[PDB]
Amino acid sequence: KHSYVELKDKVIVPGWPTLMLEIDFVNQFLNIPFLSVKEPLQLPAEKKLTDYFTIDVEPAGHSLVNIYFQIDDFLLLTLNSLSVYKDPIRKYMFLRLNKEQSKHAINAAFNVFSYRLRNIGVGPLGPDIRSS
Amino acid sequence: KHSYVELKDKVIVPGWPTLMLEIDFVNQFLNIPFLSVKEPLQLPAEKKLTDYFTIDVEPAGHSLVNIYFQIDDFLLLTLNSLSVYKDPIRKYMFLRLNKEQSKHAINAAFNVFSYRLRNIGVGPLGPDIRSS
Amino acid sequence: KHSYVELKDKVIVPGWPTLMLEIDFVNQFLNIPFLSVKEPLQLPAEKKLTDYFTIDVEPAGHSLVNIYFQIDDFLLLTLNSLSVYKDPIRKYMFLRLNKEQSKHAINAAFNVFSYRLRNIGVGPLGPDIRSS
Amino acid sequence: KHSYVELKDKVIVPGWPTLMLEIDFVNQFLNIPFLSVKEPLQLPAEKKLTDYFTIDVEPAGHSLVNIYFQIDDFLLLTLNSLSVYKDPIRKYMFLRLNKEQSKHAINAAFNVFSYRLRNIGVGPLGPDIRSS
Ligand SMILES: Nc1nc2c(ncn2[C@@H]2O[C@H](COP(=O)(O)O)[C@@H](O)[C@H]2O)c(=O)[nH]1
Ligand SMILES: Nc1nc2c(ncn2[C@@H]2O[C@H](COP(=O)(O)O)[C@@H](O)[C@H]2O)c(=O)[nH]1
Numbered sequence: 001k002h003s004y005v006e007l008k009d010k011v012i013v014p015g016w017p018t019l020m021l022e023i024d025f026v027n028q029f030l031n032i033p034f035l036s037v038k039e040p041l042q043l044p045a046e047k048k049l050t051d052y053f054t055i056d057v058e059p060a061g062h063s064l065v066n067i068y069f070q071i072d073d074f075l076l077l078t079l080n081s082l083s084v085y086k087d088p089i090r091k092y093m094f095l096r097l098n099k100e101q102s103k104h105a106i107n108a109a110f111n112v113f114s115y116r117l118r119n120i121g122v123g124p125l126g127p128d129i130r131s132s
Numbered sequence: 133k134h135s136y137v138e139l140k141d142k143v144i145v146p147g148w149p150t151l152m153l154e155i156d157f158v159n160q161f162l163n164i165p166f167l168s169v170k171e172p173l174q175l176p177a178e179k180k181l182t183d184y185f186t187i188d189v190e191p192a193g194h195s196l197v198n199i200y201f202q203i204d205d206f207l208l209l210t211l212n213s214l215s216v217y218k219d220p221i222r223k224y225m226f227l228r229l230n231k232e233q234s235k236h237a238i239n240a241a242f243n244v245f246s247y248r249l250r251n252i253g254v255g256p257l258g259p260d261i262r263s264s
Numbered sequence: 265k266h267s268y269v270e271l272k273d274k275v276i277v278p279g280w281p282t283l284m285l286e287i288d289f290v291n292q293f294l295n296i297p298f299l300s301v302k303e304p305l306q307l308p309a310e311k312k313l314t315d316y317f318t319i320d321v322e323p324a325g326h327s328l329v330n331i332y333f334q335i336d337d338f339l340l341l342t343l344n345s346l347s348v349y350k351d352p353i354r355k356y357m358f359l360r361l362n363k364e365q366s367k368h369a370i371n372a373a374f375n376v377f378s379y380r381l382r383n384i385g386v387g388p389l390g391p392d393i394r395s396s
Numbered sequence: 397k398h399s400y401v402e403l404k405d406k407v408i409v410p411g412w413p414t415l416m417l418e419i420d421f422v423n424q425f426l427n428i429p430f431l432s433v434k435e436p437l438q439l440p441a442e443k444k445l446t447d448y449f450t451i452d453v454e455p456a457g458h459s460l461v462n463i464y465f466q467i468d469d470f471l472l473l474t475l476n477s478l479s480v481y482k483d484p485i486r487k488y489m490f491l492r493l494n495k496e497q498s499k500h501a502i503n504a505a506f507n508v509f510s511y512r513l514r515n516i517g518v519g520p521l522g523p524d525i526r527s528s
């Protein structure tokens with residue numbers, strides 16, 4: 001036994017590259033800055049993300065929704081090592097969607113078609129941003 | 133005499149199945165997680181929902197809107213029994229729509245065409261989610 | 265000299281009929297529950313609203329916008345008398361738009377094409393709602 | 397060394413003309429009231445804005461985004477002088493986007509195509525608004 005802990009907004013540090021959780025429902029999508037990281041996330045060219053990563057979109061209110069995670073050890077290790085923030089990833093986590101995001105989930109009735117983690121570049125001032 | 137009490141977000145427990153209040157206006161729709169439940173909600177194949185359930189969408193501010201309910205005894209009984217949360221349904225209730233939802237109501241001028249309660253499944257981690 | 269006071273959300277009482285401020289920009293519209301009233305608002309069949317009512321949409325932040333009002337005596341008198349709430353209308357008022365509304369104003373750059381006050385009916389439970 | 401300070405909502409005073417930060421991503425745009433000013437902002441007919449002004453759109457959470465600025469001295473001087481508020485512009489600033497704005501940035505993945513500062517007029521009551 002165990003519990004789903006919150007991946008807080010603190011794990012996103014501005015000026016660093018970003019890992020974007022991308023989720024398609026079954027029409028309805030949802031882009032969520034996941035984790036600011038030091039290097040890209042290349043996976044083994046063998047394996048797909050869905051082997052180490054399973055996600056559940058549940059409602060938590062009439063207006064609000066959360067996303068729950070199960071992160072198998074390999075990814076948990078890869079991600080802690082990649083993180084700008086001090087080793088923040090646990091096997092069982094969730095994050096909250098804001099009223100705006102929440103409602104997209106709710107309309108598509110929570111039904112995840114696909115999802116993936118994309119590397120998103122930093123911008124012109126990023127160097128200078130994070131050094132401040 | 134009596135008063136309309138609030139169906140709070142607490143009645144939605146994540147990991148459990150969900151009853152979705154679906155509302156069409158007269159173009160304009162509105163999906164609202166209503167109540168997390170243990171089993172589905174089958175009604176008598178005879179009766180329609182609208183016999184035990186009447187709803188009113190009124191504004192409560194310049195930006196915000198509420199939905200009011202009258203739940204006839206049969207449904208009030210069926211729902212309390214179905215609820216994951218301890219017996220939360222009263223005959224006269226309302227719930228608040230968030231600024232985002234509110235505005236859809238306001239644009240369609242509150243005019244409800246139709247409405248219904250749909251069963252929405254749980255997702256992959258749901259078992260594990262609610263046991264935490 | 266004088267100041268623009270806030271028409272608060274309190275002046276909207278649920279269960280009563282509603283006066284909707286409708287605003288078109290120059291594509292971009294904006295519906296705002298204005299004032300809950302006891303009877304409809306018929307104007308003199310002679311005069312248009314714009315004779316007693318002039319409105320200004322200004323920004324108040326990077327994300328937020330307000331609407332300012334000048335209400336000539338006739339309308340100020342008609343409206344206080346119509347109000348469910350105790351005589352709330354002053355000659356110079358404003359109201360705040362929520363982040364959601366605000367942004368529609370901002371995109372259309374605040375440029376009001378037209379505006380009007382429409383009577384909006386009450387719904388099925390309205391009687392019972394306001395008597396609670 | 398140095399830090400990016402916040403251009404607060406206070407620098408927008410209602411009743412005064414407005415400078416609108418306009419940003420196109422690479423489909424996705426974003427209009428943000430930047431700074432309320434006393435006169436228009438004409439630049440040298442020679443130079444483009446992008447010579448004194450470079451901007452970076454970074455995420456600060458799972459749901460939220462900021463815009464960072466580098467304002468070269470000429471513009472910093474021109475803007476302080478133009479400002480209604482007491483000399484508020486520093487070389488390195490940022491401003492927060494609200495959940496609504498944030499999400500447009502996030503979807504287009506932060507990738508700024510173009511941006512510019514437009515003069516936006518005041519409205520009918522503006523005179524009277526700011527004198528109150
Ligand atoms: N609640 C939830 N349902 C999901 C998820 N991924 C897929 N689904 C499917 O979505 C269904 C609920 O939405 P529905 O298809 O009934 O509108 C469930 O039966 C489930 O099979 C998820 O992450 N959360
Ligand atoms: N306010 C409100 N009006 C409703 C509702 N359901 C139907 N209506 C109808 O919507 C009308 C108000 O919107 P309108 O059609 O004038 O734009 C009322 O006259 C009423 O007949 C409801 O739940 N709330």
Ligand SMILES: Nc1nc2c(ncn2[C@@H]2O[C@H](COP(=O)(O)O)[C@@H](O)[C@H]2O)c(=O)[nH]1
Nearest residue numbers: 319320321322373374375376516517518519
């Ligand atoms: N700021 C503001 N501008 C308005 C309003 N009504 C009309 N306008 C016009 O909108 C112009 C600003 O928007 P623009 O047309 O430059 O995008 C002003 O020059 C003004 O003539 C109002 O209520 N507020």
Ligand SMILES: Nc1nc2c(ncn2[C@@H]2O[C@H](COP(=O)(O)O)[C@@H](O)[C@H]2O)c(=O)[nH]1
Nearest residue numbers: 120121122123451452453454505506507508
């Ligand atoms: N993060 C960020 N990226 C920007 C900005 N302006 C341009 N970009 C470009 O956007 C890319 C990230 O978005 P992508 O094109 O990978 O979806 C970066 O590689 C960068 O070259 C900005 O202001 N912020």
Ligand SMILES: Nc1ccn([C@@H]2O[C@H](COP(=O)(O)O)[C@@H](O)[C@H]2O)c(=O)n1
Nearest residue numbers: 027028029030031100101104105499503
């Ligand atoms: N984060 C977001 C933003 C928009 N969307 C959807 O994708 C489409 C594009 O919406 P906008 O035109 O509002 O960007 C709409 O159908 C909207 O419902 C989404 O699914 N997830």
Ligand SMILES: Nc1ccn([C@@H]2O[C@H](COP(=O)(O)O)[C@@H](O)[C@H]2O)c(=O)n1
Nearest residue numbers: 103107159160161162163232233236237
């Ligand atoms: N909860 C919601 C979400 C969207 N809608 C409406 O249905 C349509 C789909 O909107 P999106 O493209 O933003 O999903 C729009 O016309 C929007 O006004 C609604 O009526 N209730």
Ligand SMILES: Nc1ccn([C@@H]2O[C@H](COP(=O)(O)O)[C@@H](O)[C@H]2O)c(=O)n1
Nearest residue numbers: 235239291292293294295364365368369
């Ligand atoms: N309160 C509102 C809601 C939507 N709108 C606009 O009218 C159109 C209908 O938007 P939805 O499809 O989101 O309802 C969009 O162009 C939107 O920008 C508006 O101008 N004022």
Ligand SMILES: Nc1ccn([C@@H]2O[C@H](COP(=O)(O)O)[C@@H](O)[C@H]2O)c(=O)n1
Nearest residue numbers: 367371423424425426427496497500501
């Ligand atoms: N501030 C805003 C508002 C809308 N938009 C986008 O421009 C289009 C117009 O959206 P509405 O119809 O909601 O006004 C949509 O594709 C929306 O994603 C934007 O990019 N920045």
